[PDB]
From a paper:
The association of the lumenal domain promotes dimerization and oligomerization of the cytoplasmic kinase-RNase tandem domain. The cytoplasmic domain has been shown to self-associate via different surface contacts, where a back-to-back (B2B) configuration is believed to fulfill the essential structural requirements for RNase activation.
We determined the crystal structures of G-9807 and G-1749 in complex with IRE1-0P at about 2 Å resolution. One key feature observed in the G-1749 structure is the conformation of the kinase DFG motif and activation loop: rather than occupying the back pocket as the benzene sulfonamide of AMG-18, the ethyl carbamate tail of G-1749 wedges itself underneath the C-helix, in proximity to the DFG motif, creating a front pocket. A similar conformation of the DFG motif and the loop has been observed before in IRE1 face-to-face (F2F) dimer crystal structures, but no F2F interaction is present in the crystal lattice of the G-1749 complex. The co-crystal structure of G-1749 with IRE1 lacks electron density data for the kinase activation loop from C715 to P732 and from E745 to K748 in the αEF-αF loop. In fact, it seems that the creation of the front pocket by G-1749 selects for an upward loop conformation, as observed in F2F IRE1 dimer structures.
Residue numbers in the entry:
A (entry chain A): 563 to 579, 581 to 714, 734 to 744, 749 to 886, 890 to 963
B (entry chain B): 563 to 655, 658 to 714, 734 to 744, 749 to 887, 890 to 963
C-alpha cells in the first residue's frame, strides 16, 4: 500500500500500461480513482496533460480529473475510476448485460468531443481504448467519457500520416468508432494490424450495414461522411450530433409530420416536391399501397402509390386522425409515436434518409432548425 | 500565503464567515481557483459529514463541485469551486450579466431534485447558499446549491411546530422563486418578520399582477410551493414540469396539441365542459373583440367569440396555415413561434393557466406527457 500525499493505491491493483507508465486502482480524498504513474522522463508532458484536464473536465462526457501528486521519483495523476474502456465493453463478454444503448454511448462520446473542439482542443488520438465507460450512478446510469486528448494504430486520419491538425482528424476517428460500436467490433478499414495501411490506401467497407434496413441506411449515410478521405467533406462534431442517427422515434415521426405539413400547399412542379420525388419510386417500393398491411390498405382515397409525397401525407393523416381510426387500423399501426413510425420505416427503409436529403432545400427555415445544422 | 497540503490561500482574501466561527477564503487547489472553508476542531465531526455529502452529491451540474479537504494540527479545510456570487448578492446588487431568472430557478430546482433523488433533504435552502458560477469559456453562468444536509425566514412552518421530508425544501424554494422574480421581496414579508408570518400563515404575492400572463403563471406555481399544508406542495420533479419553465415555442405547442385533442370532442363531454367553465372571463366576454382587425377580418368564419375552445381552434388554424396568410395578417400576429404565441397570451393573460388546469383531465394521455407530471 503506497501513499503519496492525498493519492493512495495498492500496487497489487494494476489497471494497465507507454514509456514506463502504469495505471493503478487507487484512492483520493476517499473517492475511488484510477492512478496513472509517470516516469521523470515525461514530467513536462504530464503537466501539459494535467492542464488540459483542468480546462476540460467540466463536461459530463469528458473524464473527471481530481488531483496530481509527485514524490521523489514519480508523478501521479488521479482520475475518476471507471467500469471499462469502450474496447473492453465491445470485445469482452458479459458487459452486454449492462444493456447500454450503443447510440447513446456514441452520442455521449461525440458530445464530449464537441466540447473539446469548442475549446480549440483537438483530440488527435480518439479510439475505443481511451473512451471510458463510467461506473453506474445511484440511478443505474452509465456514460461514456473521453480521455487521453490533446496529447499500433488503426484510427488515424490518412492526412495526419500523409504540423498542427484540425478538428476533422477526430471526426475520421469517431466515424471508425461509430462503426466499431454498432457492428460490435468490426472496423471500416479491416482487422487490427491491417487498418492503418488500408486507411492510407482508402480501402474500406461498411458491410455490416445492411442496404435495406432503415437503421443501417441512416448509420451508413452518416459514417461514410465521417470517414471520408477528403477532410473537408467531414462534418463537424455539432453537425454529427444533429444527424437522424441520433433522433428518437418521436423526433423521426415529428420530422415526417413537419415535412408533410411544409409541402401540403407546394406545387407538384416546384423544386421541393420534384426533389422529393426524384428516385422516389424505389423509395415507395413502386407502389407503397401494396407494401402496407391489409387493414391500412382498406382504410385508404386520392393518394398515389407511386408518390413519396402521398406516402408522407398518408402518414400525417393517420397520425392526425389516430383517435378516430378503426380499432383494426390502430392495431396494425401500433401506438403513437414509437410503434407508428416503425410501421413505416420498417417497411420503407429508405424513406427517412431519402426525405432528409431531399428537404435540405428547406434547412434554413425556422421550422426545420431542429433537424439540420446551420 | 498559507499552505496546507494541496490547498493554499492568502489569509487576506476573506469571502465570508459562518456559525461556530468558520471562515471562508479565496484560495487554490491543484492550480484551480477555489473557496476554502476553515473549520475548527470543535466542528470536525460535522465537517466530515459535510464532506461526505459533497462526495456523493456533486456530480450534478447544479450542485456545487467539491475538490478536496486537508487537515493540520489546528484546523480542517474544505475546498469547493470558486463562484461569482451568492444568489442573495445577485438579487440585491449584476443585472447586466443578463441572466434569465427563470433559468436560474430551473437550475436551482434541478439541483434540488438531484438531492431529493438521493434521499437528501437540504433543510436550509435560501439565497445565501445558492451559488452563481463564474462564466465558463462560453460565457455561461449557472446556479448551484450548497450547504445541504447540515435570523431565518426561509423555514417551512411544520419544521418549527424529527426527520424532515422533502416538502420542507419545496416551501423554501417557493419563497426563493418569488424572491428572484420579484427582485428582492419575500412572500412572508421583510427579513425580521418572515418567520413569524410563516408560522401565522401570513403571506402575499403582491408583486404578481393578476392580469399579466407571466405573473398569473408564476403565481399558480408559487402558491402551491409555499402551501401551509406540506402534502399540497409539489415535488421538485413536479415543479420542473410547470408552464412557468416552458419556452414560448413549448407554450404554443401545448395550445396546438390541446386544440388538436379537442377538435372532435363533443360539447357534452367533460373536457370541453371543463375548458368552457369560467371561459367568459378567459376570453374577455368576446375574444373576437380583443384581437386586431386584420385577424378579425381573416376569421370570417363560424367561430364562437364566447368559446375558449374556438379561440384555441382559431390559434391552431392560423398557426398551421401561417405561410398562406395575407401579409397584413402575418404582420399583426408576428413570426412563429415566439411572437405568434405572445400575440395571444399578452391579450388573454389567463388562457394558458386556465387551459393548463382544464386539460389536466388528459394528463395521463401520451400526447400530454411533455406537459404534466406523472
Ligand atoms: C489530457 C488527458 O489526459 C488523461 O486523460 N490522462 C489520463 C490519466 C489517468 C488515467 C488515464 C486513463 O486511464 C486508464 N488507462 C489505462 C488503463 C486503464 C485506465 C482506467 C481509467 C479509469 N478507470 C479504469 N477502470 C478499469 C477497471 C477495470 C477494467 N478496465 C477499466 N481504467 C486513460 C485510459 C487515458 C488517460 C488517462
Ligand atoms: C454539504 C454541503 O456543504 C457545503 O456546501 N459546504 C461549504 C464548503 C465551502 C464553502 C461553502 C460556501 O461558500 C461560501 N460561504 C460563505 C461565503 C462565501 C462562500 C463562497 C463559495 C464559493 N464561491 C464564493 N465566491 C464569492 C466571491 C466574492 C463574492 N461572493 C461570492 N463564495 C457556502 C455558501 C455554503 C457551503 C459551503
Amino acid at each position: 500500500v503506497v501513499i503519496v500525499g492525498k493519492i493512495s493505491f495498492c500496487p497489487k491493483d494494476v489497471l494497465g500500461h507507454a514509456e514506463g507508465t502504469i495505471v493503478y486502482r487507487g484512492m483520493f480524498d476517499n473517492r475511488d480513482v484510477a492512478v496513472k504513474r509517470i516516469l521523470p522522463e515525461c514530467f513536462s508532458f504530464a503537466d501539459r496533460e494535467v492542464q488540459l484536464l483542468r480546462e476540460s473536465d467540466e463536461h459530463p462526457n469528458v473524464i473527471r480529473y481530481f488531483c496530481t501528486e509527485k514524490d521523489r521519483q514519480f508523478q501521479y495523476i488521479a482520475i475518476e475510476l471507471c467500469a471499462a474502456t469502450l474496447q473492453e465493453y465491445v470485445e469482452q463478454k458479459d458487459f452486454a448485460h449492462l444493456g447500454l444503448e450503443p447510440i447513446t454511448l456514441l452520442q455521449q462520446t461525440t458530445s464530449g468531443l464537441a466540447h473539446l473542439h469548442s475549446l480549440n482542443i483537438v483530440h488527435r488520438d480518439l479510439k475505443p481504448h481511451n473512451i471510458l465507460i463510467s461506473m453506474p450512478n445511484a440511478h443505474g446510469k452509465i456514460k461514456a467519457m473521453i480521455s487521453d486528448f490533446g496529447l499500433t494504430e488503426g484510427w488515424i486520419a490518412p492526412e495526419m500520416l500523409s504540423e498542427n491538425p484540425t478538428y476533422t482528424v477526430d471526426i475520421f476517428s469517431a466515424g471508425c468508432v461509430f462503426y466499431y460500436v454498432i457492428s460490435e467490433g468490426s472496423h471500416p478499414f479491416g482487422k487490427s494490424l491491417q487498418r492503418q495501411a488500408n486507411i492510407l490506401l482508402g480501402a474500406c467497407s461498411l458491410d455490416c450495414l445492411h442496404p435495406e434496413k432503415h437503421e443501417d441506411v441512416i448509420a451508413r449515410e452518416l459514417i461514410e461522411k465521417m470517414i471520408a478521405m477528403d477532410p473537408q467533406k467531414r462534418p463537424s462534431a455539432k453537425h454529427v450530433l444533429k444527424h437522424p442517427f441520433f433522433w428518437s422515434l418521436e423526433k423521426q415521426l415529428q420530422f415526417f409530420q413537419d415535412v408533410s405539413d411544409r409541402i401540403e400547399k407546394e406545387s407538384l412542379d416546384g423544386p421541393i416536391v420534384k426533389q422529393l420525388e426524384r428516385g422516389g419510386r424505389a423509395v415507395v417500393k413502386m407502389d407503397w399501397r401494396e407494401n402496407i398491411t391489409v387493414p391500412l390498405q382498406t382504410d385508404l382515397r386520392t393518394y398515389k402509390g407511386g408518390s413519396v409525397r402521398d406516402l408522407l401525407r398518408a402518414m400525417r393523416n393517420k397520425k392526425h386522425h389516430y383517435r378516430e381510426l378503426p380499432a383494426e387500423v390502430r392495431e396494425t399501426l401500433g401506438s403513437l409515436p414509437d410503434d407508428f413510425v416503425c410501421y413505416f420505416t420498417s417497411r420503407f427503409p429508405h424513406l427517412l434518409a431519402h426525405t432528409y436529403r431531399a428537404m435540405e432545400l428547406c434547412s434554413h427555415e425556422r421550422l426545420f432548425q431542429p433537424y439540420y445544422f446551420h
